[PDB]
Amino acid sequence: ENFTTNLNQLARVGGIDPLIGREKELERAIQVLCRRRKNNPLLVGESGVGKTAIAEGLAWRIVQGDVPEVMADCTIYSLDIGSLLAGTKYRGDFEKRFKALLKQLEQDTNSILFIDEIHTIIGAGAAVDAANLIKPLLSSGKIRVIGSTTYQEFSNIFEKDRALARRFQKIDITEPSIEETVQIINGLKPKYEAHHDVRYTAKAVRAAVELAVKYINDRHLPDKAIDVIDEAGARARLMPVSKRKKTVNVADIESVVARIARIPEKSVSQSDRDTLKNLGDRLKMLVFGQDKAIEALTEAIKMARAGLGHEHKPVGSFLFAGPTGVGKTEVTVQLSKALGIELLRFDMSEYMERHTVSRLIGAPPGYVGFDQGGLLTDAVIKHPHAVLLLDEIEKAHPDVFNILLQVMDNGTLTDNNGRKADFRNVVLVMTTNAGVRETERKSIGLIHQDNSTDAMEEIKKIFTPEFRNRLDNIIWFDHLSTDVIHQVVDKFIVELQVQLDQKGVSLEVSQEARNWLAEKGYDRAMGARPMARVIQDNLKKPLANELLFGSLVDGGQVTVALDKEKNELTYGFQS
Amino acid sequence: FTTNLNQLARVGGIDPLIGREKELERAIQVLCRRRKNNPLLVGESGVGKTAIAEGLAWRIVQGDVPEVMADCTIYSLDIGSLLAGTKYRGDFEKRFKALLKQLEQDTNSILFIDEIHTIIGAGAASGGQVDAANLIKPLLSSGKIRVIGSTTYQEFSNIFEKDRALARRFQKIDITEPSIEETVQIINGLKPKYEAHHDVRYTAKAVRAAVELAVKYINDRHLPDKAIDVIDEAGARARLMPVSKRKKTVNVADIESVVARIARIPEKSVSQSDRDTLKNLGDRLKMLVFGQDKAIEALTEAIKMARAGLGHEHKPVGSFLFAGPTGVGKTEVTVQLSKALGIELLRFDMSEYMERHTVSRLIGAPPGYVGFDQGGLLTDAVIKHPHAVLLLDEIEKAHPDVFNILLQVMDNGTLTDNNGRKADFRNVVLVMTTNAGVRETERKSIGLIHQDNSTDAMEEIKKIFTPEFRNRLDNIIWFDHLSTDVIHQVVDKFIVELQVQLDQKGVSLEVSQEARNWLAEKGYDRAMGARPMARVIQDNLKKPLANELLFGSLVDGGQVTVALDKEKNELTYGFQS
Ligand SMILES: Nc1ncnc2c1ncn2[C@@H]1O[C@H](COP(=O)(O)OP(=O)(O)OP(O)(O)=S)[C@@H](O)[C@H]1O
Ligand SMILES: Nc1ncnc2c1ncn2[C@@H]1O[C@H](COP(=O)(O)OP(=O)(O)OP(O)(O)=S)[C@@H](O)[C@H]1O
Numbered sequence A: 001e002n003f004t005t006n007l008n009q010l011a012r013v014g015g016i017d018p019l020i021g022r023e024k025e026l027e028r029a030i031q032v033l034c035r036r037r038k039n040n041p042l043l044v045g046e047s048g049v050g051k052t053a054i055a056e057g058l059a060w061r062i063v064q065g066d067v068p069e070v071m072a073d074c075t076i077y078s079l080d081i082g083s084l085l086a087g088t089k090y091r092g093d094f095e096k097r098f099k100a101l102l103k104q105l106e107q108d109t110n111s112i113l114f115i116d117e118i119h120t121i122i123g124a125g126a127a128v129d130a131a132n133l134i135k136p137l138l139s140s141g142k143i144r145v146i147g148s149t150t151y152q153e154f155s156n157i158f159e160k161d162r163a164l165a166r167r168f169q170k171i172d173i174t175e176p177s178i179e180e181t182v183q184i185i186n187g188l189k190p191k192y193e194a195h196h197d198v199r200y201t202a203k204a205v206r207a208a209v210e211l212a213v214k215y216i217n218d219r220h221l222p223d224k225a226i227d228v229i230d231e232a233g234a235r236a237r238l239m240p241v242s243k244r245k246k247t248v249n250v251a252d253i254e255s256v257v258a259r260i261a262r263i264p265e266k267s268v269s270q271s272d273r274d275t276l277k278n279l280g281d282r283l284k285m286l287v288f289g290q291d292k293a294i295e296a297l298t299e300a301i302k303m304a305r306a307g308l309g310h311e312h313k314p315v316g317s318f319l320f321a322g323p324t325g326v327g328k329t330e331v332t333v334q335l336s337k338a339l340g341i342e343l344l345r346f347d348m349s350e351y352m353e354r355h356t357v358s359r360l361i362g363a364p365p366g367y368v369g370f371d372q373g374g375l376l377t378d379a380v381i382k383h384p385h386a387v388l389l390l391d392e393i394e395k396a397h398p399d400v401f402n403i404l405l406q407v408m409d410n411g412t413l414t415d416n417n418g419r420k421a422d423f424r425n426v427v428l429v430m431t432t433n434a435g436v437r438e439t440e441r442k443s444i445g446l447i448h449q450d451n452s453t454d455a456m457e458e459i460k461k462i463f464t465p466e467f468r469n470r471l472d473n474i475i476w477f478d479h480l481s482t483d484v485i486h487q488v489v490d491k492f493i494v495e496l497q498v499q500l501d502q503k504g505v506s507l508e509v510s511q512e513a514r515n516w517l518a519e520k521g522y523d524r525a526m527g528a529r530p531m532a533r534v535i536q537d538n539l540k541k542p543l544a545n546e547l548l549f550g551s552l553v554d555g556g557q558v559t560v561a562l563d564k565e566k567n568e569l570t571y572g573f574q575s
Numbered sequence B: 001f002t003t004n005l006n007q008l009a010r011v012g013g014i015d016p017l018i019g020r021e022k023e024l025e026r027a028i029q030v031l032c033r034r035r036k037n038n039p040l041l042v043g044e045s046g047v048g049k050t051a052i053a054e055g056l057a058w059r060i061v062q063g064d065v066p067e068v069m070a071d072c073t074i075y076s077l078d079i080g081s082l083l084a085g086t087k088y089r090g091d092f093e094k095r096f097k098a099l100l101k102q103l104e105q106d107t108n109s110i111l112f113i114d115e116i117h118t119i120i121g122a123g124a125a126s127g128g129q130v131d132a133a134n135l136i137k138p139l140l141s142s143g144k145i146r147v148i149g150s151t152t153y154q155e156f157s158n159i160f161e162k163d164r165a166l167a168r169r170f171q172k173i174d175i176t177e178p179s180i181e182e183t184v185q186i187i188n189g190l191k192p193k194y195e196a197h198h199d200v201r202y203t204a205k206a207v208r209a210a211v212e213l214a215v216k217y218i219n220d221r222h223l224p225d226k227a228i229d230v231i232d233e234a235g236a237r238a239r240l241m242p243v244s245k246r247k248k249t250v251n252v253a254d255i256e257s258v259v260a261r262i263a264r265i266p267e268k269s270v271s272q273s274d275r276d277t278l279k280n281l282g283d284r285l286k287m288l289v290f291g292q293d294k295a296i297e298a299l300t301e302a303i304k305m306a307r308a309g310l311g312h313e314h315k316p317v318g319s320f321l322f323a324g325p326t327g328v329g330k331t332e333v334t335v336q337l338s339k340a341l342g343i344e345l346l347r348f349d350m351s352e353y354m355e356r357h358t359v360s361r362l363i364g365a366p367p368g369y370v371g372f373d374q375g376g377l378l379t380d381a382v383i384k385h386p387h388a389v390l391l392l393d394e395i396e397k398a399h400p401d402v403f404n405i406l407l408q409v410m411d412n413g414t415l416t417d418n419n420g421r422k423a424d425f426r427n428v429v430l431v432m433t434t435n436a437g438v439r440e441t442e443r444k445s446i447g448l449i450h451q452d453n454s455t456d457a458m459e460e461i462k463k464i465f466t467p468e469f470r471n472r473l474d475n476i477i478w479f480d481h482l483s484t485d486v487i488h489q490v491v492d493k494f495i496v497e498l499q500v501q502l503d504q505k506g507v508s509l510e511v512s513q514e515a516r517n518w519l520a521e522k523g524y525d526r527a528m529g530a531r532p533m534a535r536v537i538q539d540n541l542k543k544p545l546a547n548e549l550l551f552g553s554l555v556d557g558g559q560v561t562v563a564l565d566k567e568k569n570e571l572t573y574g575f576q577s
């Protein structure tokens, strides 16, 4: 009895919060507990769902007396695994303690042993135990045992074995709905408020549940809700030393979630109106190229968030096309950086093999637990509120395109694992380099002919006609201009200047050098991708060599220019 | 048994806490909570987590923290005294319970137990009737008692997985190494003890230098301990190293040589006079490798950037994917690179780790996580030698899972072992050799006159290697086929190899200049690289010499002359003995 703690006695003295909800799940446990055989119940639920608390609720019902007379005199106990494994150091010493407790429980009838995290004690698992004594107590039917096990590790421990599954009844314990969860907070509000004497507004508690699931995406919302609430209350209790701000507002809860999320407060805060209003301004600040596309794309985002009365379909389905590395990927990453979401990257070129298609929605080789599962489907579940970047969509197998249609139309994807993804919030973007390839090729003729083709016709050849109708608007990048590329060179050198600033050496670049580096580095076929290679090997190699051994060890004071006749850069350094 | 930290601060025994404001504010907030009111400080050995519990009490007397946290006296338990003190039977229950009574009935009672893992169960051998962890859990569940934890990163995982209930009650707190500015400030508080005990005086430049010198060279130890370890050793050095000088002052020179011995690096390396090392590095490779001048330029320039510091500091010094034909010395140049640098080279074969089952071994231990300490083979190598050349032969053959791991190294240059210490590639040069370019265009173009049919360069490798991996790479060093003129230089070094072998047997070999030309042309094969030179030398020079060394005049050793007659275009050898 020393190892275990009587929950029934605990309720009499208090300290158990009144359970709210889960009336059907709680009633189910009592029904199975009254069975002649297989009375032992199981609670298959994820961490934070509230599977441990529902068992506590049963003890409260017994003390309250709102149960049949059979269970009115019954008692419940909670097995402490830590107490049993405290200092034994040998497997089998633990078992002796378990046997002694079973005899103590067996003498008195109407005793229930609530084994929390039953999966740990039974089964070999992955990351110890014997599991020899759990089987006889189940087959003997003397004392009922309530076992809480997660969905994961239950299929590999209970379904694999007949003895444990046969004596245990499975109770699906799903996460509560948003409406149900906010009601629970109201039930628990008097206990938390009494601790620090602060009053919570209805808006803040409702916002906490809604925002927590959207941003945290780590554990289930019931546990997350109580954490942010208690954290905000504790923070509010001691945040101002001089001022006792007994009142609470949405401002306080926003900062608390930002700290654990480690994301800027502005993004975490429910400032969707503010962020959407300045979405273009923030994006345009860092990147000043392709303003025409930004204006069309920025407006498409604001209207997309509204949904036009249709929300089941994915909010974002914009497709981008044009020359490679001319801003197709910069806008996507900068869009995520401004929003603060975690950008995901997948190259369809890599997934151009039928075996690779299976990798996206599962694992061809045998895996244990299917933890890796699909390369993309699992990532979507990990971060549903994040943008999905696809590269070289043109070079993909035909079957892959069929799967894409289901995402935009059906709004959900089913794979071998069976996990569901809420594509409503999910956004999608793609980049197509096929269009630039068509203009690069030369016709089979004595005199070449204009290869410029309408962007719409090019897509029809490589993409099915059943996709452009479901899309919002097509954005195409034709080519950069001299004024845009020239300005970009100035921005890129700043990174080198910032890098040199910490080292303690200054740098000076002539305007003529900047103009010359732009024409060579920029390529129509390859966009701005070779510009980084051209500019880096040109500037980095001479400066790096001199900086180590030479006059530029300390001081800097460099000068760069190019002779007109030579048309080649010249580097000057001052000690 | 227990010592009041709050009162110790008034006496002044504990040094005043500085910095770590972010950690402290987080701790008071979680402790303030109704539930989950037990902060757990998780870190590593030397991070300074122990000084936060003692440092926290110091702030209470000062009054900087909120009034609610004020008026709370923090006590500290003793792991050894409590267990050792209860030699008699049944004393532990009354003693631990009597001690609990002091904290009980007091809303402001606070308690700290360093190394919380030690008290998972304690003071009982025969039975588990009373447990240190579970004796305080029922009362703690009601919130009467609030405690503070302090455990290591790896050890925290054991309690977290084994006991989910305890994990809920304890709120994990991430601890990080203190800033360079904070480190020097902390050493000033400790400096009186070390300087007084050793009868030495530490200069302001010496203490500051140790912080940057140790992190640069010492690897396994952590920065607070690293700075304090060298300071203790540095003072001791003054007493014992100089017999007659008996210097009582610790200078930067006195506190930098110790870091060299502690790190087992060459003396004067802390001086950072690496300009000469990089000046002749390029020539050193060309002298032993002929025909890859282009690779040396691109390869040397990149290493120069990293040593010069022109680049992402987190990113490793270099990322390279050696590729080309067989026998072009892609592996040889890599080995010679380490020798010229004078840095130990760690070679790893990816063929053994071709499949996922063996990929574990490289990054972690097998299912017996605690059974085998080796864990990840790559991490301990870097930990043992943070400055090293890592060779990965036949990288393409490996499973794509390893490629995913390499992306992280290029992104931030960090890797974490499942059961071991942390490792970083900031000071490690990544070089992996692939055989994607070994394809040979054996077939020739149809027609009376052959035409150049060269496979497109770097296009095929795109399919073999993952696309995202290629984008992160700095440069790909392709190895061109050996030129005919280059062959002559390769032959010359093979004679030196043959010569040293012959010297052991007492034979001296003289080879004419025309002899080298014949061997070079006969054995020229671009498809087989330089390897045929060893075969033609083995076939034309070693074979006849072997017969004479065992069955002829060379049993005792002597002069040998090699030449070829123009009339027959065949080599003729002359033995003198
Ligand atoms: N009706 C309710 N439904 C769910 N949770 C509730 C409810 N009422 C209160 N809670 C609280 O919500 C939290 C639920 O935690 P649980 O999901 O039971 O934890 P757990 O799954 O046992 O955690 P582990 O040990 O980490 S798997 C506790 O703080 C409960 O007291
Ligand atoms: N450029 C070179 N200079 C000197 N020796 C060379 C050169 N290239 C190859 N060798 C010789 O080739 C042998 C080493 O071959 P490796 O460098 O291991 O082959 P590799 O270039 O990695 O190609 P494979 O496909 O792995 S055989 C030694 O005998 C070297 O001396």
Ligand SMILES: Nc1ncnc2c1ncn2[C@@H]1O[C@H](COP(=O)(O)OP(=O)(O)O)[C@@H](O)[C@H]1O
Pocket (backbone or CB within 6 Å): A287, A288, A289, A290, A324, A325, A326, A327, A328, A329, A330, A488, A528, A529, A532, B471
């Ligand atoms: N508007 C722009 N302003 C500045 N740089 C740009 C702009 N658009 C594209 N770039 C540059 O184009 C390059 C794209 O590189 P990368 O991401 O490898 O291209 P890709 O995704 O086509 O393979 C980066 O250097 C990026 O900064």
Ligand SMILES: Nc1ncnc2c1ncn2[C@@H]1O[C@H](COP(=O)(O)OP(=O)(O)O)[C@@H](O)[C@H]1O
Pocket (backbone or CB within 6 Å): B015, B016, B017, B018, B020, B044, B045, B046, B047, B048, B049, B050, B051, B052, B055, B186, B190, B224, B225, B228
């Ligand atoms: N004000 C301070 N802030 C942080 N650390 C400090 C401070 N004062 C001293 N220290 C250092 O804190 C360290 C505590 O080490 P500790 O956490 O006990 O190590 P371990 O985790 O290996 O047991 C000591 O090295 C001590 O010098």
Ligand SMILES: [Mg+2]
Pocket (backbone or CB within 6 Å): B330, B331, B393, B394, B433
């Ligand atoms: Mg090789």
